[PDB]
Design a protein around this ligand. Structure first.
Ligand SMILES: O=P(O)(O)OC[C@@H](O)[C@@H](O)c1c[nH]c2ccccc12
Ligand SMILES: Nc1ccccc1C(=O)O
Length: 259
């Protein structure tokens, strides 16, 4: 129910933003934004893609990094060979913001994933207006009807949905919703326990055409390689990178893992 408390805060925060920037305005801004980058093409490039994340804090970790300059962090990520930059935009528990998404979008050429708790259409157009190419949808957070709607709207704007699951049953739901990219989060968003075997148990079940992403818990090359050996097409890493004194070198180490 960490997840439930997060969603309560998110719904209130979204409503307050919408009161200042209307749904019509954000839809217009999204329509006017330059088209999203082809995330699927990025994910199909050779090698295990590293999705490097901008995250200042989390429920499980508390404060991780000040990240006064998220653009400069993202530039390091791209310099290190990251495939995609993930930007956490949730304010109350992760100390992120849409400002971070703008800063990162303006600083890198690689695709940008908005990492937040998407529960209503407003957030989807908002992500697009602020330059997101990829958008997280969390199966644990969304009733199937809502998941399918959110996925449809995401794709309608040309963005790719990263549909996040923690169980086989959630993976089955993701497939039925039309997921083309499925992320397995090793962290249980309810209880905050990290189980890195999740990906290995779930990944084999997926149609080969679905892109598989392993999220969370990567401390170094060994963890990345373990995910790759279980079939990950990409791996998403936050804590180990944001706490680095040399994010460029840390990313490059992961990017070149197994060489
Ligand atoms: O810092 P880690 O253990 O490398 O994990 C990164 C990422 O997977 C995690 O921050 C995350 C996974 N799903 C999310 C949803 C919202 C915010 C954050 C996340
Ligand atoms: N990434 C998360 C998403 C939801 C709740 C907690 C976390 C965490 O890392 O602590």
């Amino acid at each position: 129910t960490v997840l439930d408390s997060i969603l309560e805060g998110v719904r209130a925060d979204v409503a307050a933003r919408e009161a200042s920037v209307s749904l019509s305005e954000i839809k217009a801004a999204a329509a006017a934004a330059p088209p999203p980058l082809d995330v699927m093409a990025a994910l199909r490039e050779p090698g295990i893609g590293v999705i490097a994340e901008v995250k200042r804090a989390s429920p499980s970790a508390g404060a991780l990094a000040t990240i006064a300059d998220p653009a400069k962090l993202a530039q390091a990520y791209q310099d290190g060979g990251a495939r995609i930059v993930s930007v956490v935009t949730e304010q109350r528990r992760f100390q992120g913001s849409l400002d971070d998404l703008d800063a990162v979008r303006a600083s890198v050429s690689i695709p940008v994933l908005r990492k937040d708790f998407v529960v209503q259409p407003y957030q989807i157009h908002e992500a697009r207006a602020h330059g997101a190419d990829m958008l997280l949808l969390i199966v644990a957070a969304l009733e199937q009807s809502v998941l399918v709607s959110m996925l449809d709207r995401t794709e309608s704007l040309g963005m790719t949905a990263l549909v996040e699951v923690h169980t086989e049953q959630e993976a089955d739901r993701a497939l039925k919703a039309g997921a083309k990219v499925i992320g397995v989060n090793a962290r249980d968003l309810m209880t905050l326990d990290v189980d890195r075997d999740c990906f290995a148990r779930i990944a084999p079940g997926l149609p080969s055409s679905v892109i598989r992403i392993a999220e969370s818990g990567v401390r170094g090359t060994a963890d990345l390689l373990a995910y790759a050996g279980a079939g990950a097409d990409a791996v998403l890493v936050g804590e180990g990178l944001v706490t680095s004194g040399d994010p460029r070198a840390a990313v490059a180490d992961l990017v070149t893992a197994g060489t």
